[PDB]
Amino acid sequence: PAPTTAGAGWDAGVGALVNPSRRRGGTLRLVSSADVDSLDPARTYYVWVWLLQRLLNRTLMAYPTDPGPAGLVPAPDLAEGPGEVSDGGRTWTYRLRRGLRYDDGTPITSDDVRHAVQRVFAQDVLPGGPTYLIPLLDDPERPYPGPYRTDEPLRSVLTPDEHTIVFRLTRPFSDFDHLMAQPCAAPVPRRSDTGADYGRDPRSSGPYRVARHEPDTLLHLERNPHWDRATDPIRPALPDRVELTIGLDVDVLDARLIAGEFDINLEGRGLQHAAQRRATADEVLRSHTDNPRTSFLHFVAMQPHIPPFDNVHVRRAVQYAADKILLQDARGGPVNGGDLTTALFPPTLPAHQDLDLYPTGPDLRGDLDAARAELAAAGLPDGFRAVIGTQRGKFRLVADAVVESLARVGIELTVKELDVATYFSLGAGHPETVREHGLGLLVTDWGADFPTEYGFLAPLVDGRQIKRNGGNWNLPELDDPEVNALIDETLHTTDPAARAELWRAVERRVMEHAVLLPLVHDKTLHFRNPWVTNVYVHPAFGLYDIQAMGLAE
């Protein structure tokens, strides 16, 4: 086992590949504390299930097998080249490779990519996955009801022949290749589409297919005999089989992982506290551990619709009075609490910049003079009473640190815990819940659904992205027409450097509003057993790229 033999070294899989190999064979033994959310490629949102989807299904574009920056740029997979952009970023054309096959030996055609995209529109039958494609492809004057309610194709998606697909968007969208790399755009042939039941027998265009799924118990993958290695620039497809054990307690999982009973943790939520201690303090175990950024941001939102948070000076007071050390310590410091940040973008993104509008003093513990001055400006010099919304666990400990921080300047906060299961949907994520319970501050964590500035920031701050019926991620309900207009400009800007500059302007404007208080970029500790080959943290996921892995002989 790993505790008795040294590994590649601390962080060896962060920005590089550990134990490179082309050796095929063996069974990759994976573990997760949770079952998949779905085996329908359109109905998944879990990051680790998206990783699993790289074994099961190909897409037009896919993130390349690359530990460096280029891993963030979608590469041709089923398509012969990247999307060809015409009409100002409004029309995207792809050409499909010829002769490709599903696991049942039937052909992949452009009709199947159109069908997959159409399926997304059937939210009454196929909820659970990303819906970015809907506003880009739906005609508001002639709405598309999905492929079960009409057999007329979506008018914005053309298939001039079996190997060509054309997407006619409602507006420019610079990041369209990224949407083609999401699993909901993996082809689904209509002939095999059993709708609500698709996850029970999905077709596979990837190097593996589902052999057995027992809910809460196991998922076994075997090779897809019709996948063609010569046609796949992404996937080495090394193991003969992949076996996922499901449902273990998270500490039980760490223990058995470190003991060698499983090879890798697919779920990828990192070592829990006990194993984090064990692993980071033992010389041999550190050699088997990577500590990447996950690209998640932990932050507090302030909601102008909840008095007195409508006043920019109240919001700035909170920013100045935040004890950044105490808050990081609540989330795992002094040594394991993520990476301190004063701005929003993760350093994976081109726009990432120095921005600290509200510095918290030479010790980062709060500038209380600045905070009090802001409170005087708000006409509340002695403070005020407010409520912070959170959920039990780590979010609660962070809320407590906020309470303690702000008490120093007379802002008296009461904590309101919301239902854990629905926190992101019906709790923090519902504008009516937030108003009903007076949640002027909210504690949350956010990861982009694709590794770009738009994917990361638009859902958090774009006025058009306020979700009035739940699942809202623009928590302050910021609707600044200048912010919105800048975002629009990025979407039709072809030059990546001009785009970065525009996004720097958006971020600065968002911080001027002071509605988001960034706390840390999250970090995690992944453990890798030394006999696993090709282990690397995928910069697009913050998790190991499962599909690239093999087994040493």
Binding site: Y45, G393, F424, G447
Partner: peptide, 6 residues
């Protein structure tokens, strides 16, 4: 997306 999660 939101993060993972006695």
């Amino acid at each position: 997306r939101p993060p993972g999660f006695r």
